[PDB]
């Protein structure tokens, strides 16, 4: 999911 990719990117995950 795109939002998950955005979240992980900003979380360093």
């Amino acid at each position, epitope marked *: *999911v*795109v*939002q998950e*990719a*955005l979240d992980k*990117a900003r979380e360093g995950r």
Partner: antibody
Amino acid sequence: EVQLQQSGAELVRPGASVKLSCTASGFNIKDDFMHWVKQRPEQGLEWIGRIDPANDNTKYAPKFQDKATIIADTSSNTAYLQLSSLTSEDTAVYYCARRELYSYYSPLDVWGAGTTVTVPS
Amino acid sequence: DIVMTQSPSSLTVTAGEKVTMSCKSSQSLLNSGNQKNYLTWYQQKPGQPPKLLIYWASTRESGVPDRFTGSGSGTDFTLTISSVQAEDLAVYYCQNDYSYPLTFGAGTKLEP
């Protein structure tokens, strides 16, 4: 003021490769996913893929995995799209777009003017 | 892969006319985690790149005139233009911004 500057028209022979540039101005690409989209003459939009300049994390549409390579140079604030083993089917306008990361969510809000690549039959 | 189907393929418009365009996805674009539909609408004029109009199905991008209204949820989306202006002649595309690969509809062309 924010914009994406794209390189000039490219006339390339079949079998060769070409690298298109997308230079950001007004913001640093390390804070944005940089996308590439293809559009054949009289046709619709085809997403190619994107890269996260901060860590070089990439994601491609399966159909372009073997054709495109997306890279970024934070120093020159430029994103790139390299197309390999060119064929006439690669003839199209290639747009770059950005997705900023400061917003919880933001769409592809800023787009470049596009670069036309022409590969004769 | 999510297929985006837009209709009508084209529409002959006149100034001041009200028009509606449909965009249907083969899979829901509603993110259950935040209850937002990841559907984006763009306007593309000849020789120009796509221009963002609305995102999350109904949120208008700053600067976009109020005559443009996006609506719908799940798999059924609509772009409405209350009163067509000459500057509105273009192709309108909807885009699945929910999951990879990102995909676009074939667009609805507003013609003279």
